[PDB]
Ligand binder design. Structure first.
Ligand SMILES: O[C@@H]1CO[C@@H]2C[C@H]1Nc1ccc(F)cc12
Ligand SMILES: O[C@@H]1CO[C@@H]2C[C@H]1Nc1ccc(F)cc12
Length: 164
């Protein structure tokens, strides 16, 4: 079946809790595999020790830039970027896990967790999972955001991996 992955998040060195995500490998296997391996760190690089660098209240919480920590970086397990697998899953509401990008077919490692229905991103961003547990943690992350995306606290993924 589909993998379950986790992100243990800190805000200025104090733990906020765990966000558990279901990766829709059934619909987007390439995109789900990329995220899964980046959580376990089995390819020699991944999300552990990196940040939520772009957090916007009433929109989303963006992370995944483990190379530059500023929105210009991160990489996939396949290479520096990979194609948009498909646009089958929609940005239906809060809790949606989707890929961050810089235009068509520029998927790396950067991703976001929606805090609202982001329907205008359908056909532009690849949806590949959703929050199973820890939406209270996502809401804590959100509260440390601003309109610019700048965080008021340093939000770090201290640990991440695969549950099943
Ligand atoms: O072709 C340009 C240059 O490279 C990629 C795709 C596209 N826009 C962009 C923006 C930010 C970034 F960090 C990386 C990129
Ligand atoms: O190679 C691609 C395109 O450029 C960088 C690295 C990688 N993924 C990504 C995603 C969002 C973004 F804003 C910037 C990037």
């Amino acid at each position: 079946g589909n993998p379950l992955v986790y992100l243990d998040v800190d805000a200025n060195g104090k733990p906020l809790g765990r966000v558990v995500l279901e990766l829709k490998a059934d619909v987007v296997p390439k995109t789900a595999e990329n995220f899964r391996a980046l959580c376990t760190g089995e390819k020699g690089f991944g999300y552990k020790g990196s940040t939520f660098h772009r957090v916007i209240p009433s929109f989303m919480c963006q992370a995944g830039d483990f190379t530059n920590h500023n929105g210009t970086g991160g990489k996939s397990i396949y290479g520096s970027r990979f194609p948009d697998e498909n646009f089958t899953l929609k940005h239906v509401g809060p809790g949606v896990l989707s890929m961050a990008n810089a235009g068509p077919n520029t998927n790396g490692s950067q991703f976001f967790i929606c805090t609202i229905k982001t329907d205008w991103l359908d056909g532009k961003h690849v949806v590949f999972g959703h929050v199973i547990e820890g939406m209270d943690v996502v809401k804590k992350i959100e509260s440390f955001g601003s309109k610019s995306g700048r965080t008021s606290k340093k939000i770090v993924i201290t640990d991440c991996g695969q549950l099943s």
